[PDB]
Amino acid sequence: ASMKFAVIDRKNFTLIHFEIEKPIKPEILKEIEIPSVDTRKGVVISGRGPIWLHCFLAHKYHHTPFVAVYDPRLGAVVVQSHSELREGDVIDVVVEEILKGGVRHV
Amino acid sequence: ASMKFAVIDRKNFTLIHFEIEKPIKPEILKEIEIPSVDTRKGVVISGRGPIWLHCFLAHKYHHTPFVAVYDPRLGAVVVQSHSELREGDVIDVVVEEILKGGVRHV
RNA sequence: GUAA
């Protein structure tokens, strides 16, 4: 409810970037309405938030070819997959760069 | 391996705590050999490490009643469930406290 | 463990 998502689509994946107002409470997970995504594509998840949030979100996209978790130092780290990307693989993405010009956070 | 686990087992869950040497690289996920756990029980995961490690780990226990991700400020945040516990619920455990006296990290 |  009080947390907004952005959904950027590319051929090889759909990036999902979240933004959080202030501190969050775990209770909020009961109410998050997760962006719907093209299931023929792996997903990359980014956003500044605590670990539980990321884990929660990553799970919710498990039915997809893969889930990669962004890390500004490295890129997007595959953490689970059903595709030819393997866990530990790194997708070259720079999120700070893709979000230039600014993106509507729905 | 570069990474050791501890498993503390309790009626209402199996706590899994990890410890990491150095800065890890994502490659390592190809090699982690995950502790096998009583499936009649949810799991709690704790350890200082990057997000992708946690997310990876949490996924790997998804076959259990639930997965909760530890947070020293709050307790253990459920992030997946097939038991009574709901996502966003908080299990009351203090890991810094349960590890007093030292626990063999296998 | 609020992008170790």
Swiss-Prot record, chains A, B:
Q: Which Pfam families match?
A: Cas_csx3
The record's similarity note reads: To A.aeolicus AQ_377.
Q: Specify the species.
A: Archaeoglobus fulgidus (strain ATCC 49558 / DSM 4304 / JCM 9628 / NBRC 100126 / VC-16)
Under InterPro entries, the record lists: CRISPR-assoc_prot_Crn3/Csx3
Lineage of source species = Archaea, Methanobacteriati, Methanobacteriota, Archaeoglobi, Archaeoglobales
Name of the protein: Uncharacterized protein AF_1864
